[PDB]
Write a protein that binds this DNA or RNA. Sequence first.
DNA 1: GCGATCGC
DNA 2: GCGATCGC
Lengths: 177, 177
Amino acid sequence: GGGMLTLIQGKKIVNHLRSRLAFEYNGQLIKILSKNIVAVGSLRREEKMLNDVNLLIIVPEKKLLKHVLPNIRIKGLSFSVKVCGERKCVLFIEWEKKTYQLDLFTALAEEKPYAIFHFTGPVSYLIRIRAALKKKNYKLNQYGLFKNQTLVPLKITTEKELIKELGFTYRIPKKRL
Amino acid sequence: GGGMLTLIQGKKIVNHLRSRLAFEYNGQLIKILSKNIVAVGSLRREEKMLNDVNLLIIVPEKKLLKHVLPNIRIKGLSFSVKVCGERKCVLFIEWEKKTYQLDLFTALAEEKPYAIFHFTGPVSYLIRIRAALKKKNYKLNQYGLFKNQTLVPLKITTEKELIKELGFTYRIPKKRL
DNA sequence: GCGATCGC
DNA sequence: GCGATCGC
Ligand SMILES: [Mn+2]
Ligand SMILES: [Mn+2]
C-alpha cells in the first residue's frame, strides 16, 4: 500500500533516483543515465497530489530488455520488488519513514515518443484519442502506430511531432483531458 | 516471494483454512462453508511439489462478489494482501515460520463445474481442449460454454458431467494434460 | 483503448 | 485459450 504524495515530494524523489538507477547485466553493474529517465504519469501532468511515482526508462537495445527491470538497482534506497517483468516493474520504496509505489517502465529508443505519449496519459485522453483513430482502422499504443496490424513508419522523433502527425491538437501534459 | 512446498504441506494448509475463511459484508462477518471451498491448481493435480496454494470459493449470489474477496478474513492466521479484486485475490500467508502464496478465486454456483474444470488445469490441457472447441465456433471459459457469445445451457452439475458433455475423455486431475 | 503480467 | 487485475 503506497502512500499519497505531493507534487513537490514526487519531484524530489525523481531527482534523487535520477542519478542512482542501475541494473546488473551478467554480474556487471550498468548505470542508467539521467537523459534516459523520463518522469511520466500524474507527475508529468503536474497534478498537485500523486498516488505514486512513475518513470519511463529508455533502453538502447532490445537485447538489454531481459536485464534492465528484472535486475534493477537503486543506490542507497530501501525498496522491495512486487511484480516485475521486462516492460513493467512495480517497486515499493522507503522515503523518509513512508512507503511509496514506484512504477518503472521501459521503452526502446525507436518507441520513445509513443511511450512518452502513452505514459503521460491521462487515461481518459488516451481512450478518446485511440477511439477516434480506431474508427479509421488505426491502432495506437506505446510502441507505434499500426494499421491492419502493420507499423505505420512515421518520420518523427518527439511526442509533439507524433501528436501533430496523428492530427490531434497539441496540449502540454498539464492540459490534456 | 512465496516458498515452495510439498503436496503434504499444501494439503495441511488447505485443511487448516477450510474452517477459518470468512468475509465481512457491510459490517457482518459471514463464514464461508467448507463445502464451498475447493482446492484447485497443482494441489488438485497431486503434484509432488507446489509453488503455492490455490482455493476456489463458491459464492451463492452475484451480489456477494463485491464483498467476498475484497473483505476476506482468515481466523488466527497472519497474512497480507498483494493484489485483489472480486474474482482473484493473492495473499501471502505465514505458516510455521515460512511465507507462502495463497491464491483465492471465486465462482458463482451456476459457474461451479466450469470453474473447477478451468482452475484444475493444467494450462497445456486447457489450451488444447479450448483450441478444439474454438474450431467448432464454441468458446469455453471458467464461467460457461458459449456459442456466438451466448451461454450454451448444459444440464450438468459436476466437472465430470461437463467433460462428458463437451465430448472429451474424462481423466482424473492427476492424469490430465 | 490497448498492453503487461499474472491466473489456471 | 481465455480472463483478471492493473499500468497509462
Ligand atoms: Mn503508477
Ligand atoms: Mn497460484
